Design a binder for this molecule. Structure first.
Ligand SMILES: C[C@H](NC(=O)[C@@H](CO)NS(=O)(=O)Cc1ccccc1)C(=O)NCc1ccc(NC(=N)N)cc1
Length: 247
């Protein structure tokens, strides 16, 4: 997250931190995610496409820091890793960048609710916030494009939704952005999501209710003028979400 402020998991209780186990013994951070139900975390496919081995992943809930433990945190294994079959990456655009992770503790249980672990609501069919609406994003991603390290403390910021028409302009992203995607940015281009924030939530207040409106997917650079962050439009993948989370 470029700009914004440091926050704690108590303020983003649905945020899930996903790590990858390595050949040696070390564990590195992969992407963000959101808990949509006790047993399901939603993220982005580009995070796992190169290593689709579910056993290499660890999911942490209730965690405020990257490389250290937080009181009340819970560790989970990945029971099932569901990637979207029509995922593809072009010059800039990442299509159908959405993934589902079924989690389970070593005891074979799903997440238990607490002050630091809560679920986030999914949107209604084709019901997205009006453009110009302020939404929040959370992540452990880079604070600056020139950084090679991620921040140790969770961060958050507020961005505004941009219309498909404006984002489709020549100086923005042109025809690369589709209706299955949502653009969001800071009107002053000072705050934005960046590398490492992938898979994280774009949360918007829809009729007094906190809703998972998007998933951090892609963008040209970070915090650059006329180059908004692009998010996977969650409301369009509800049928896909429902069909894969049943049984
Ligand atoms: C895998 C994906 N790739 C890209 O977004 C590529 C185009 O496919 N663009 S990029 O190389 O400019 C991303 C980037 C930005 C800064 C440093 C390293 C990489 C990605 O990095 N997603 C996370 C990500 C999401 C949004 C942004 N940009 C933004 N909010 N303006 C920056 C990064």
């Amino acid at each position: 997250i470029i700009g914004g402020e440091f926050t704690t998991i108590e303020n983003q209780p649905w945020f899930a931190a996903i790590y990858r186990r390595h050949r040696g013994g070390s564990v590195t951070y992969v992407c963000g995610g959101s808990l949509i139900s006790p047993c399901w975390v939603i993220s982005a496919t580009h995070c796992f496409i190169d290593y689709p081995k579910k056993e290499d992943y660890i999911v942490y809930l209730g965690r405020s820091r990257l490389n250290s433990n937080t009181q009340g945190e819970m560790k989970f294994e990945v029971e099932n890793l569901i990637l979207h079959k029509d995922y593809s990456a072009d010059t800039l655009a990442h299509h159908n960048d959405i993934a589902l992770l079924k989690i389970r503790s070593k005891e074979g249980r799903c997440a238990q609710p607490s002050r630091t672990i809560q679920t986030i609501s999914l949107p209604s069919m084709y019901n997205d916030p009006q453009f110009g609406t302020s939404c929040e994003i959370t992540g452990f991603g880079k604070e600056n494009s020139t950084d090679y390290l991620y921040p140790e403390q969770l961060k958050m910021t507020v961005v505004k939704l941009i219309s498909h028409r404006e984002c489709q302009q020549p100086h923005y992203y042109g025809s690369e952005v589709t209706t299955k995607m949502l653009c969001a940015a800071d009107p002053q281009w000072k705050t934005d999501s960046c590398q490492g924030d992938s898979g994280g939530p774009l949360v918007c207040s829809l009729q007094g209710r906190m809703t998972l409106t998007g998933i951090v997917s892609w963008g040209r650079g970070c915090a650059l003028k006329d180059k908004p962050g692009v998010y996977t439009r969650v409301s369009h993948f509800l049928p896909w979400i429902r069909s894969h989370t049943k049984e």
